Amino acid sequence: MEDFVRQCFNPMIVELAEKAMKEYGEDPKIETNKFASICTHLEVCFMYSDFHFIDERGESTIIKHRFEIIEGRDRTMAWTVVNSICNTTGVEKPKFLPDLYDYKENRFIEIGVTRREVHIYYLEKANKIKSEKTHIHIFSFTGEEMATKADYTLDEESRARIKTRLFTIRQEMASRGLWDSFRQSERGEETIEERFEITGTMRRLADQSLPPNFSSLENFRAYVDGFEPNGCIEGKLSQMSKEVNARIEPFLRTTPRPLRLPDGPPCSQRSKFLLMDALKLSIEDPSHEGEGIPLYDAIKCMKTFFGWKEPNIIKPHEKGINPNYLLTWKQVLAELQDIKNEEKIPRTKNMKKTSQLKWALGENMAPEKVDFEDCKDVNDLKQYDSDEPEPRSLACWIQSEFNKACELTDSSWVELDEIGEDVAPIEHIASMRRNYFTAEVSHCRATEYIMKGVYINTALLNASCAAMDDFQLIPMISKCITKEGRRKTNLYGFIIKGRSHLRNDTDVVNFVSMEFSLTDPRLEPHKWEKYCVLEIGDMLLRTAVGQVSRPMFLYVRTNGTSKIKMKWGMEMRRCLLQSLQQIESMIEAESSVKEKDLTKEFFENKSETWPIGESPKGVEEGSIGKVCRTLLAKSVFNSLYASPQLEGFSAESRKLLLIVQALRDNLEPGTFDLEGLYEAIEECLINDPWVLLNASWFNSFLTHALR
Amino acid sequence: MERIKELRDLMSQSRTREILTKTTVDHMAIIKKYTSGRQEKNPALRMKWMMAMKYPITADKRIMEMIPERNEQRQTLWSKTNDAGSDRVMVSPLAVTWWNRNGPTTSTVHYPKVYKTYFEKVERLKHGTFGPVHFRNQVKIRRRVDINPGHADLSAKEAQDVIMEVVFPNEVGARILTSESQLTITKEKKKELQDCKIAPLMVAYMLERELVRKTRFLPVAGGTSSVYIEVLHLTQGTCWEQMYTPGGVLRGFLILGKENKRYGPALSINELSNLAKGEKANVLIGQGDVVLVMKRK
């Protein structure tokens, strides 16, 4: 506002208004509305006075000055001027201070600029000041005006100029967000400051919001206003017991201890689909009729396998009814045969509701929702079971999963879109880095997992959206490019989706997944506690003795998913980005130390190896491609096994890693509650196989780094 | 007509009539921020699902005139349906592609004029030269940097005045109308965009990008001129620096007062040119202020 006042009026009026405010001890910085009011009044008075002269005969000509200003001067000097004028012209003494003197009309003219309506202002002035023989002119910012007896001393041109000036000032204040305050600061003929009082309920609430030894907010304000620092902190510190301290305990090579992993039965697999036990039936070069539509591709993939036999239960699901799973598989086979022999198959196939499918999808198993009062006397009624989760011990199968996810596959799984040609040298460096990383990770098993998750989650989401209340059959499919460059379509199994009345993002749609496999569950039953595994056929494999027929099993389980989970699965390609970033980050960090680009040293050296694993002999080193694939697998497993325990462990063990690093840098690390940090880390280790594997990894790293 | 009838319908209701009669134009923008409902969650999934529909795009009835119902392959480009708000027809992206490959061509001469800043960026990048990349520890320093240089002479509010004069001539306020002289840039842009069919809102946005100075508080480690801030993503990083050099009539009115019915119906701003030197007239200015004004003599 003050900036607007200074930039809007000419410096002469600004100085006049500043002097006027100084005369009354008013600071323009704090009283901005009063400053603007004074400036506007002075501007209007000067515009009224200016451009008005008196000819030699007595008439007024527009070019003796017709007007004498009385407002823009000191009160004593203004009184002197008014007294001289009255004595010379024999006019009556004005009771209050006038604004100017009109010589032609021989009177005292008072000009008032009103933020409110003109007539109210005029009535107030008449009831307050006018009294006798005083002309009053009232202007408004809206173009209105008023005068005594509708008599306007000035010509229409000057009045129009004043009206235009006030109108434009109003418009600029409105555009600058200042007109509201300016208009709300006028009461009568004065200009008050902002008012905001605490009274009534608010005053009592404030009086109840103080330190213990104060009764009213005014007393607390008085205490704070006169407060001066007199050794308060020093005295309080001298009064506080020495038991309140932050004693640094040294962190040496012998202080850290291994994390205590939980005990109990070994953990089990909880992924949505098989990872290293997955078996796929593949069709190369998909050139069949109706290509690109999952149902027909699944049909063709099924046709390529001969060896189907009578299914039977080999690994029962201790919690479920196995015959339901067996009948679901039989029904899937029967419906596939039916569509095959029908010779006219549509884009989607919705399973017919059946007892086996109703049970396997948990249909009607949801307890009915009733008011608590109507069922508060039930003896069995209890708070929803949220007991402490049962701890599980680390099992060796998760390490094998990661090892298999870190290795190369005989075919490519990701095909990225092209970008523009590189021109800048930094663009060439970026392209080299990205191309090396992509060449190292394009054939990784983790890329296959990424594509599997993306495809399966996309299909599940689309089926849920379209077939709202139908038992849709969704084949689990992925696409690949072999070394020869021929496209291949792989089928891992099928998913039957139940009712999908998904209103919110966190409500569950239940599905049943059947997945082909070549691994016998009986070797690791604890890994498959949530599965019912059937032996569905026999597969011929070529070995040194010819064609060996090994059993082919079907891992069947009921699972559930939400919209958020499906979206999370569909975004798995981001994992690749993450891994690349990590690799890039390392290079950049190293480059900063070496003051040169190290992309070639990282990738083209082919003699630098990083410690990336452990064996009975000791720490094992791997090439850059191995590091890239390992980081990609870690990202993919973080995405697949995302849980609160994982992020808790990551956050808490980052501190311990940094402390160990500071120890390795000879920076004399020290802690305050190291045991507390260990407790925080170990509270996240209950049952998740991925988090337990990460904890075991940290223990091994500690063993090797302390040495 | 449609708009006046909608106004009458709104004024029929007590609450909307209360709003319309109470809220002044000054506060209109404020009540423009009182939105209802909520915002779409996962708009990307929504767009993906919509793109699978046959007719997910909304056009106007005029599309029936030139775009055929079906193409050579008998695929239906548009259908007959409305959006429940107006006569907006439902069309496919196939319609967009069909227009792009077979639609009526025109002369796109105003596009280089309207989007001057974008083509200037294209020229600056096209003729630029690159040097080596230097790796080192980066010492960034924070300063205010001009994202848009704007016109050197024009200010921010003066640039807004130019934009209002060019794009919305009959909505200029009292400050423009009562001014004494017009700016050369205003006449230049007026002549340049005389017959331009691009949306006036887009033209106003482009003129704002071209004439208004915009500044941002950014950390830099090199050139801090407008041409260098746009390629910041390309010239600096966490630990590297890339050497690059870029390749490059209606005035003089006095407000006499509020509307005076004895001087006739209110006029538009554009038709103030037919007033005599001194004649008084009622005119609508700004965003709905009827004022009795006259020319200076």
Place this chain on the structure above:
Amino acid sequence: MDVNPTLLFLKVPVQNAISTTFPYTGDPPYSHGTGTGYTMDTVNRTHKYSEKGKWTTNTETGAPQLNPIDGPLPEDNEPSGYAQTDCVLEAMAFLEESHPGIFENSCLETMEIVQQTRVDKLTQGRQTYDWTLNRNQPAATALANTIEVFRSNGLTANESGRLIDFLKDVMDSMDKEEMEITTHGKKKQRLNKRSYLIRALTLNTMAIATPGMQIRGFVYFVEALARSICEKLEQSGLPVGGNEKKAKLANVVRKMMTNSQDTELSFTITGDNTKWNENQNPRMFLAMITYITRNQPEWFRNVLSIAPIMFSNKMARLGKGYMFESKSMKLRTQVPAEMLANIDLKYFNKSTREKIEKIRPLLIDGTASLSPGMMMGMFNMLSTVLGVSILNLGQKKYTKTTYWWDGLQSSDDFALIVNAPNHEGIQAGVDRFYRTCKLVGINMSKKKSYINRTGTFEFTSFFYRYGFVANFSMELPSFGVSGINESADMSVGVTVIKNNMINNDLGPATAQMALQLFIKDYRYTYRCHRGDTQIQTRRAFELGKLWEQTRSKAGLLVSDGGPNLYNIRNLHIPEVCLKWELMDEDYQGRLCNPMNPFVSMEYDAVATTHSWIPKRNRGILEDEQMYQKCCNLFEKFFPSSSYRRPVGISSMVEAMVSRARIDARIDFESGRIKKEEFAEIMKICSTIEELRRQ
């Protein structure tokens, strides 16, 4: 060979490979760790850290309130809320002394802000607690509901358009003996003074808690003052971000280490202050606000103190409640937290039982009384000011010893650096800093804090090592289509990648891979594959025909089946202008024909045929779009209102009527409408004028 990724740290230092310790790039799909039990836990914890304070009963709400200010000094290292008023005032005084004039200038800036603010400022928040509906609503909806109820209760000052007048309305409503709520045919509810007061003093739990509209404006003013204060403090980590954090980490290390002599010893604490908001007392915030606003106009002090005053008598909503299930017949039910105060204690587990017994005496009409402490996300910058004052207390002129400290504070983390002649001096300085923090109610997490020789440390996910700082405080954003249209999606994707490179430290190769992923997603979404390829889609035939017809295929947009020419060089260039020179003349004219039937974070995009609008699919206010229905129909009367904020004295209806009359007259005088239409329009305008006069 068992693969162990963390063994990579045997060669690469942890700071250089810190990215590998962050599991997710994106919000994880569980969003767990909240509920009624957690709210009870935080309430009980806050009351336990202050239990040695003075108990009082509020005379306006009847809520039990605990005041730990000036309580007994702590005897152990457990979290304490016994902040000493004299110590806080002394810290503020010394901060003012070390930065003379800071409070006065901040007060002047905030005075301008307070005078120039508008009510619609409250529409810019996130989910807020609507007391008119007793539930969470969007900021705009809650503000509109509150304005409607205030109008129906004879509260109108907010109609002036100034936030200060809305706050005056809030103060007036606090004095209302009765508040009437009308819900839409009609349903009338009456709230007595106490019920409305409690409702207006609640924070809803679903930043974790959310306040209502009655405190948002006061909190906004207080946070503006805190922002003014913090901008002038070099030791504050807010509100700056990005490479500014890097610069100030470097500066603090340089000033604490380089300035030191050859015989001086320097150590750095990477310190956590997790859950330190529980011990932040609103009364202490009122004390420091009172000290800051000394020698200021009384109205300004009144507003700034009203904010903490309201926070002092705040109530916490317990939330949804609990879910009960039965096994005998497979039953389920939901028990709201409102009946949780008058229920038996056998349906819950042991731990929930203890929570309920602990919290029962504090329950008042479905809300727990929570006087001590604060909820995270409201007074972050005031707490930053307090922490920076304690850091400022580390100068040699204030320690009076051979040790001295300096550091960074950001309301969610802190970094300290202590210089002393020897190890004993370092320990003494650390003890002094910890004890002063205890004096002012700041509690340091010993478990999550650690010290080491200066040279490496961490602060707000910025990892400093020997001058190199890795910024990992932000996650990689989504690089998929935004979902506006083809043009907007392409522009937004390229702009997002460019801005992540500029501000979020995104690497070049990572930027290229992100561009590739975005282009794949865009082509999949809009079915705009290259056209020379053989992907079968409903749009494939037209794209192929256009591809065969065109001569310069590089000029085609990606939405038209053209190639992607974007690289790091040109992420700042619009796609249409990027390939404008390569376009065929006929294709360019068709694409950029303004007379086409399709066209109807700040991103740059040219208006083309691809700017179409997609199909749109689809309380206290009878009509929720009332304000939008009014604001629309004003833009088709004054189009400039879309580009510029309109200004005028007359009411909206009068402006629209005058414009309608003028337009009708002009269009009739040009042979564009006939006598019947002119008469109809004039008659309707007269009817509207009568309606407005009535």
